[PDB]
TrEMBL record, chain A:
Bilayer disposition of the protein: Multi-pass membrane protein
Protein name: Bd-type quinol oxidase subunit II
GO annotations of cellular component type: plasma membrane
Localisation per UniProt entry: Cell membrane
Transmembrane segments: 6-34, 55-74, 80-105, 117-137, 162-186, 198-220, 232-252, 259-279, 299-322
Keyword tags: Cell membrane, Membrane, Transmembrane, Transmembrane helix
UniProt source species: Geobacillus thermodenitrificans (strain NG80-2)
TrEMBL record, chain B:
Pfam families documented for this protein: Cyt_bd_oxida_I
Gene Ontology cellular-component annotations: cytochrome complex; plasma membrane
Positions with a binding annotation for heme 2: 183, 186, 252, 325
Record-given protein name: Bd-type quinol oxidase subunit I
Keyword Transport: yes
Organism of origin: Geobacillus thermodenitrificans (strain NG80-2)
Lineage summary: Bacteria, Bacillati, Bacillota, Bacilli, Bacillales
InterPro entries per the UniProt record, alphabetical: Cyt-d_ubiquinol_oxidase_su_1 (IPR002585)
Keyword rRNA processing among record annotations: no
Gene Ontology terms: biological process: aerobic electron transport chain
Alphabetized UniProt keyword annotations: Cell membrane, Electron transport, Heme, Iron, Membrane, Metal-binding, Transmembrane, Transmembrane helix, Transport
Main localization, broad class: membrane
Automatic annotation (TrEMBL), chain C:
Source domain of life: Bacteria
Classification of source organism: Bacteria, Bacillati, Bacillota, Bacilli, Bacillales
Name of the protein this chain belongs to: Membrane protein
């Protein structure tokens, strides 16, 4: 079952890899939406949305690579998670449908270009939550409560101090990460707002996000003590992450070389997410959904890993070359 | 019915999603080839009108593509959602190709994106052909890999059943099953073809109305000729796949052709009406094909449907689809085969509306034949999944969610299709 | 084997025929 732990280990970083670009795109198609709510300029939306969408295209590759990969290692999730997660999926998919439909229609549709930015306002934010529900429930329960497993009313598990902790763990960090990326290459005199909003979202990161990193800890004490213990055993990683965040904040406060702000950000939420995963591992919500349950054939595990390599080996250099077409300076 | 309604509702929803998906997909597969060819023709001929049609197409190829993507995601997610216990077993085996489809798609999408945003910057047209070659290759690669799923669903193996648990998986055995060739082939052919008729259906529209001979005659002249070819190949691989069925899964074929009885020389049918419970109405049938030049021996005994268990047989309303699909095939092939022949290289009928109309119908007919064909090949399939795989009846989840989400999605897609059509016309009427 | 392989062949052929139209009765005619 080593290959099965490596699989989830990598796929987690597919979800992270998604999180990276998705933050940028969902921050963009939102901040840009407000900043252009005032003066819905088709010139600016044209010039913008000529280059925004490719990111959003790249995202779904991470997303679907993850989604299609995970079930290769764990079909039993495709049973359980599949059979449970009946609604949020469809919603997320609607939100996506909307995103994309309009990403396309706007390309050659100025009528939609201005009015259906509303939709980007809606979705650009709503999506993070709609994933955050599954990311939440993945460390929660459908028929998994305290003393020895009481059947739960899924309709009332929406409202909980652990879920909005994940909604915060997402939204605000979407905001912050996106803001950091936008700031990094903010090669303009009009980049003072990006760093102020980035400051607000950095303060949201030190607050609501790193707050929620502890809301999860102080929810797990009453919820899942094993996960709490693991999370205390990788809390030093959240510390490291906080320190990297502090580095990105220092780059915010001081210099123009935000490369290190992006690297520090990267390692920051990378570790803040990778610990957040590690602690949850090795298992997937249920004791029946532990990595080694429903043991699969492990050749296609290797093949799938090969496919993930083949994937990343495009996903990354697409962006590494996407960040050489905008420079041509080597 | 709290876990049996979904057995139907799911099927229904899935149909509604994918049915949409395909409209925005076979285009995704066939268009890029055509684009490549147009570029190549423009380049080889030094005629910078074809080179305009390449991009003129691409510009919408994008919008098609996106709508394709979203519905693709939809189905992708819907997969395990609606059919958990299915993936509980087969997910181990389906995982890879499914991935490789979208991988191939991203690989194409890179170069697509390069051409899209380098044709307006960097040098020379060949260097844009070389960017458009990987695209079509990646498109057809999607189809290869993704179809390998269905092909596999239709037929094992590359697994072993430990009291239900599916293990001992060989990638390429499950991927390269017996159906894969015919599926991949017929699917690629009848998707080059389809888009080939789709572009002809633009050229014939624009040429029929505001007769700007300029592009719109060249377009037709190419697209029709290629469409002919692809329809021919399509039909060949049709006969092939049919023979495959006749040999390996006559449950479908005998339901398609209503051969309840097993015989040597067994006549095919053009169109009839047997209501599910033996009610032979219209009866137009010819002697047998898939034996004389297929098996090389007319008296090759076709398996009958009676000899299939009635819990193992699919519906009888399948025939209608074969009728549709095939007849569209032949008709459309004929229209194609005449256009270039008679309407160009003989009696200058091109400018006649008598063609331009038919050629306007051309593409839609093909897409129809697509949906039809898919219905045929997939619905001959419902009562096998419940055996060598796992009970379709025990593949779904819950009811009172599906019934509604189905309608939500119904709406969603309804909007998608319409909007897409609208924008995608608007663009063409803007004439960029 | 022949009929298991053949389809893809037929296809491959159809493709390069579809190309060959562009050279035959497109470049040097009509
Ligand atoms: C009304 C007809 C119809 C019905 C009842 C179904 N499908 Fe479907 N299916 C088609 C009509 C179709 C299609 C909608 O027309 C598709 C979509 C993709 C394609 O090429 O044709 C096809 C293809 C298709 C593929 C193609 C994979 C590939 O070759 O790339 C898969 C995996 C499925 N379907 C899955 C299902 C499952 C799991 C069903 C549950 C019973 C199902 N379909 C019912
Ligand atoms: C052959 C035909 C076909 C088919 C059958 C299919 C079948 C399918 N599919 Fe597909 N796709 C396609 C063709 C196709 N397809 C394409 C072409 C594309 C590109 C875009 C468009 O659509 O246009 C895709 C795309 C896509 C996607 C996206 C990716 C990203 O995002 O990146 C997805 C998710 C999916 C899923 C799916 C599924 C699940 C299925 C079932 C299995 N797709
Ligand atoms: C579109 C156009 C088209 C066309 C023309 C055609 C034409 C034809 N076809 Fe087809 N199909 C189709 C489209 C089509 N198609 C489809 C889509 C389908 C589904 C998928 C597959 O392939 O499977 C089919 C399917 C199919 C089948 C089944 C397969 C399986 O199941 O595996 C068969 C047998 C046939 C035959 C045939 C023929 C014989 C012909 C002659 C004409 N098709």
């Amino acid at each position: 079952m080593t290959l099965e732990v490596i699989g989830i280990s990598v796929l987690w970083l597919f979800l992270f890899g998604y999180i990276i670009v998705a933050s940028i795109d969902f921050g963009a198609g939102f901040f840009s939406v407000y900043s252009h709510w005032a003066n819905q300029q088709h010139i600016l939306h044209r010039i913008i949305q000529r280059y925004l969408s490719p990111v959003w295209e790249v995202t779904n590759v991470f997303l679907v690579f993850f989604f299609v990969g995970i079930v290769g290692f764990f079909p039993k999730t495709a049973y359980y998670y599949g059979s449970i997660l009946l609604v949020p999926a469809s919603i997320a998919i609607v939100l996506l449908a909307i995103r994309g439909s309009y990403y396309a229609f706007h390309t050659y549709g100025e009528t939609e270009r201005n009015w259906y930015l509303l939709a980007y306002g809606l979705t650009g934010l709503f999506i993070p939550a709609s994933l955050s529900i599954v990311l939440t429930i993945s460390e929660g329960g459908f028929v998994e409560e305290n003393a020895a497993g009481v059947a739960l009313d899924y309709g009332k598990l929406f409202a909980s101090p652990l879920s909005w902790s994940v909604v915060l763990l997402s939204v605000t960090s979407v905001l912050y990460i996106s803001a950091v990326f936008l700031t990094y290459y903010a090669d303009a005199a009009g980049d003072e707002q990006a760093r102020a909003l980035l400051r607000r979202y950095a303060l949201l990161w030190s607050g609501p996000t790193m707050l929620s990193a502890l809301l999860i800890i102080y929810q797990l004490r009453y919820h899942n003590p094993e996960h709490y213990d693991n999370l205390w055993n990788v809390a030093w990683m959240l510390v490291i992450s906080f320190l990297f965040f502090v580095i990105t904040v220092w780059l915010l406060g001081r210099q123009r070389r935000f490369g290190w702000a992006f690297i520090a950000l990267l390692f920051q939420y990378a570790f803040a997410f990778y610990a957040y995963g590690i602690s949850h591992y090795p298992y997937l919500l249920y004791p029946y959904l532990t990595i080694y349950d429903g043991f699969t054939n492990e050749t296609m595990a290797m093949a799938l890993i090969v496919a993930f390599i083949a994937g990343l080996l495009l996903l990354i250099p697409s962006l590494y070359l996407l960040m050489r077409l905008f420079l041509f300076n080597k | 019915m709290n876990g049996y309604d979904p057995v139907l509702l799911s099927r229904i929803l899935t149909e509604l999603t994918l049915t949409v998906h395909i409209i925005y997909a076979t285009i995704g597969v066939g268009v890029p080839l055509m684009i490549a060819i147009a570029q190549w023709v423009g380049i080889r001929k030094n005629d910078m009108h074809y080179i305009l049609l390449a991009r003129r197409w691409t510009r919408g190829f994008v919008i098609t593509v996106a709508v394709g993507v979203v519905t693709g995601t939809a189905i992708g997610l819907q997969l395990s959602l609606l059919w958990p216990n299915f993936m509980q077993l087969a997910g181990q085996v389906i995982s890879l190709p499914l991935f490789m489809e979208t991988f191939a798609f991203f690989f194409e999408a890179i170069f697509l994106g390069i051409y899209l945003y380098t044709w307006d910057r960097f040098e020379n047209q060949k260097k844009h052909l070389l960017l458009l070659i990987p695209v079509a290759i990646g498109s057809s690669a999607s189809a290869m890999f993704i179809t390998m799923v269905n092909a596999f669903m239709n037929t094992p193996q590359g697994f072993e059943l430990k009291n239900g648990e599916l293990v001992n998986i060989d990638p390429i055995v499950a991927m390269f099953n017996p159906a894969m060739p015919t599926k991949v082939a017929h699917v690629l052919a009848t998707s080059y073809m389809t888009s080939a008729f789709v572009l002809a259906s633009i050229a014939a529209w624009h040429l029929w109305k505001g007769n700007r001979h300029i592009y719109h005659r060249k377009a037709l002249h190419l697209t029709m000729k290629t469409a002919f070819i692809f329809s021919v190949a399509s039909a060949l691989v049709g006969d092939l796949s049919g023979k495959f069925l006749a040999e390996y899964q006559p449950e479908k074929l005998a339901a398609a052709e209503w051969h309840f009885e097993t015989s040597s020389h067994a006549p095919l049918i053009l169109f009839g009406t047997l209501e599910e419970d033996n009610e032979v109405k219209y009866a137009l049938e010819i002697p047998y094909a898939l034996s004389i030049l297929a098996h090389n021996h007319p008296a090759a005994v076709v398996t009958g449907l009676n000899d299939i268990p009635e819990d193992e047989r699919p519906p009888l309303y399948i025939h209608y689809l074969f009728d549709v699909m095939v007849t569209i095939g032949v008709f459309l092939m004929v229209v194609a085969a005449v256009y270039w022949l008679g309407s160009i290289f003989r009696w200058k009928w091109t400018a006649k509306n008598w063609f331009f109309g038919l050629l306007v119908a051309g593409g839609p007919l093909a897409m129809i034949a697509i949906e039809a064909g898919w219905y045929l090949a997939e619905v001959g399939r419902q009562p096998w999944i419940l055996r060598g795989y796992m009970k379709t009846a025990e593949g779904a989840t819950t009811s009172a969610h599906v019934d509604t989400m189905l309608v939500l999605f119904c709406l969603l897609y309804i909007v998608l299709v319409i909007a897409s059509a609208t924008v995608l016309i608007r663009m063409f009427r803007r004439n960029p | 084997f022949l009929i298991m392989y053949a389809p893809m062949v037929v296809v491959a052929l159809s493709v390069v025929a579809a190309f060959w139209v562009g050279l035959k009765d497109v470049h040097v005619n009509e």
